[PDB]
């Protein structure tokens, strides 16, 4: 059957070329550029003593959770820099963290396959492990909360797992990737989500159906970052090949590619602003570059990090952008 | 200005900062060690005898030094996506069983390739490697009948453990493309009680001394 798959892949490529009547770059020629954009380090979150790999903004645009190799999650009050909570972790090897949309639960994980769930509204006051989600055979990569009861997880098993927090069982298993999954992104309605994989392809999945819907290709190296467009119809990706590509679910094809000759390092994190016109991506050269999602031009550079930009996120309302780095500091722009 | 609730929140944040500083100091005082090697390389027995689904952390103390060993053998994923997490490890413990020279993956070549990749990894440029040659008794018992030439065609001389394990160690060290910046510590493992722990302690002390010397400008 390996002969048929190549022919049908060629057919899909032909169809994608056919539907590509025009390109975003050509049509967006008359669109006025956003101009040169700058953001100042309004807040410098200090208190971490090890590399920071993940962070997530809360639905209120004020509380944000961060994960570092110290084995402790710090909940920061972005408006005052105060540490709302300090959550010791059973394993210091934590690479991902998630903040529940309601703000009642927080999840994290890393080299340990168990995805710890933490409750911030405990009657005891101190944060305790709500439940341990075990069953993965690979290092956990990303976490995203659909609600207080449903969470989608991606790990190095090459399969993304859907977990029911109340029972702790794997509600659904997503399969189809040929490499380790490194990133996750939930749609605005949470019905659909996409995950980046080391196979240089991004696969779209339907939570309700529990199966893949689309697969996107074009990257040359491992995909490390992925984020949905605010409208929920498109998403951007980041990969080690130092290029960021925008894909549309409806078109099932790449819309724009963001890369520069002098940028030789890969992309670790990617996110969209509230309007989606500005694309912010992290890099291994301890700086962040803002790319025009329409004109593909580098609007600005968010410099100030010392070692490496690993995680990046935008508030729910887009008021500010918080970018983590390996120097154990998170800067809010 | 800050209100009463804001002042209390600030005080709580400062207390959390104090706790974080204490935890970071405790982590700094304790030594972090990374474990690598094949499943049958004896690393399992090494971890079992040094204990005084995913990664396993083995915390133990010896002569006032708190040692925590990380076993990443259970991670069946490409290292480069997560190997960077161990950039700050003081030393890396690599376990190789000398009896694999005649095994079938030639898994000795696979172990050599893994050692080469780890040693020349850009994250471990300044990280020393503590090489553990395991199952030396079986290696010497079997070499007298099975020559070492199976794995190393270039090997010459008598086939005895004394001049065979040393040759294996030299071949392993030949993979060093950056001998100037990093160092390798090699030990021979037996059915000991604490000699391996003693060697680990000595290697950690030597690494600390070398780091201090480099900070002084020497070495």
């Amino acid at each position, epitope marked *: 059957l390996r002969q048929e798959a190549e022919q049908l892949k060629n057919q899909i490529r032909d169809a994608r070329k056919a539907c590509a009547d025009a390109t975003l770059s050509q049509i967006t020629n008359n669109i006025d550029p956003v101009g040169r954009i700058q953001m100042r380090t309004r807040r410098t979150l200090r208190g971490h003593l090890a590399k920071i790999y993940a962070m997530h903004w809360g639905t209120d645009s004020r509380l944000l959770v961060s994960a570092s190799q110290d084995g402790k999650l710090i909940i920061w009050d972005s408006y*005052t820099t105060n540490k*709302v909570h300090a959550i010791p972790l059973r394993s210091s090897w934590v690479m991902t963290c998630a903040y529940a949309p309601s703000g009642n639960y927080v999840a994290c994980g890393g080299l340990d396959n168990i995805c710890s769930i933490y409750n911030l509204k405990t009657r005891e*006051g101190n944060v305790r492990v709500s439940r341990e989600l075990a069953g993965h055979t690979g290092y956990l990569s990303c976490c995203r909360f659909l609600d207080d009861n449903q969470i989608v997880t991606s790990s190095g098993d090459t399969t993304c797992a859907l977990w029911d927090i109340e029972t702790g069982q794997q509600t659904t298993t997503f399969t189809g990737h040929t490499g380790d999954v490194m990133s996750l992104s939930l749609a605005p309605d949470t019905r659909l989500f996409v995950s980046g994989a080391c196979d240089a392809s991004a696969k779209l999945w339907d939570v309700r159906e529990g199966m893949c819907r689309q697969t996107f290709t074009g990257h040359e190296s491992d995909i490390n970052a992925i984020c949905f467009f605010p409208n929920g119809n498109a998403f951007a990706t980041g990969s080690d090949d130092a290029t960021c590509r925008l894909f549309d679910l409806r078109a099932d094809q790449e819309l724009m590619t963001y890369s520069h000759d002098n940028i030789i390092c890969g992309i670790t994190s990617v996110s969209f602003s509230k309007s989606g016109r500005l694309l912010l991506a992290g890099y291994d050269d301890f700086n962040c570059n803002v790319w025009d999602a329409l004109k593909a031009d580098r609007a600005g550079v968010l410099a100030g990090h010392d070692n490496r930009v690993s995680c990046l996120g935008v508030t729910d309302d887009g008021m500010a952008v918080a970018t983590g780095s390996w120097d154990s500091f998170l800067k809010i722009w | 200005t800050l*209100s009463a*609730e804001d002042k209390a929140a600030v*005080e*709580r944040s400062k*207390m959390i900062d104090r706790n974080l500083r204490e935890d970071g100091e405790k982590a700094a005082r304790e030594v972090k060690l990374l474990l690598l090697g094949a499943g049958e390389s004896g690393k399992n027995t090494i971890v079992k005898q040094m204990k005084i689904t995913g990664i396993v952390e083995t915390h133990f103390t010896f002569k006032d030094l708190h040692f925590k060993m990380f076993d990443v053998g259970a991670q069946r994923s490409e290292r480069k996506k997560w190997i960077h997490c161990f950039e700050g490890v003081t030393a890396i413990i690599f376990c190789v069983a000398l009896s694999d020279y005649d095994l079938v993956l030639n898994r000795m070549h696979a172990s050599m390739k893994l050692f080469d990749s780890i040693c020349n990894n850009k994250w471990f440029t300044d990280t020393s490697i503590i090489l553990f040659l395991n199952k030396k008794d079986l290696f010497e018992e079997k070499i007298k009948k099975s020559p070492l030439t199976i794995c190393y065609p270039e090997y010459a001389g008598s086939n005895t453990y004394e001049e065979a394990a040393a040759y294996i160690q030299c071949q392993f060290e030949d993979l060093n493309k950056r001998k100037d910046t990093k160092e390798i510590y090699t030990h021979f493992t037996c059915s000991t009680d604490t000699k391996n722990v003693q060697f680990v302690f000595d290697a950690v002390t030597d690494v600390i001394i070398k780091n201090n010397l480099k900070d002084c400008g020497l070495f």
Partner: single-chain antibody
Amino acid sequence: QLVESGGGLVQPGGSRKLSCSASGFAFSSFGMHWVRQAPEKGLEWVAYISSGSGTIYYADTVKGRFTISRDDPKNTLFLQMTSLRSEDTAMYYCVRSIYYYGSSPFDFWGQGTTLTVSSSDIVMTQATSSVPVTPGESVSISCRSSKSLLHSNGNTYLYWFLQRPGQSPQLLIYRMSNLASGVPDRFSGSGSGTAFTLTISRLEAEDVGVYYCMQHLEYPLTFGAGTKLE
């Protein structure tokens, strides 16, 4: 839960140690307040100690005479009382509180102990002394303060407490907008500067009690005269 011990009869000018044992929660990270209620009057804040004993405050009426200390290993809170006056007679309540964004200070109140003896603060006003009520009838309680509680940060620091007969006061609404955990969604609070109100819709059983409005702008903390529902 919080339980208090050390009450009894004390002659005027004497000393009596008051202790509060804490269990079922991380007492170390919870701030502690002492509130006394006279047998025929409303609540009155006594002293406050922050987590770790880093900050300690006392009311002007008990400044110096009363000392508040904590002992984390035993999860016990102590209040050294000396030179007691006649007016000091009241039932002391052990209050649990934690301060962080989105927190609910004064969420839990201890059972309390009865103490009897032989013989520029913010003013909180509750003109609605009493309002006879029956099940199925909506209720509105108005509380007034001499200072605007709308802080520059945007948070309105107002707290509502309901004290059923024979039971210690329980947090009802904190910051005028957030309902305490476990409180039914029936209760609601809203208002503007210098004027606050508490509204209860479709009252029914287990609603009879005294409602106290408290301000948390700065110490010393003050409580209103109290609105009695019957």
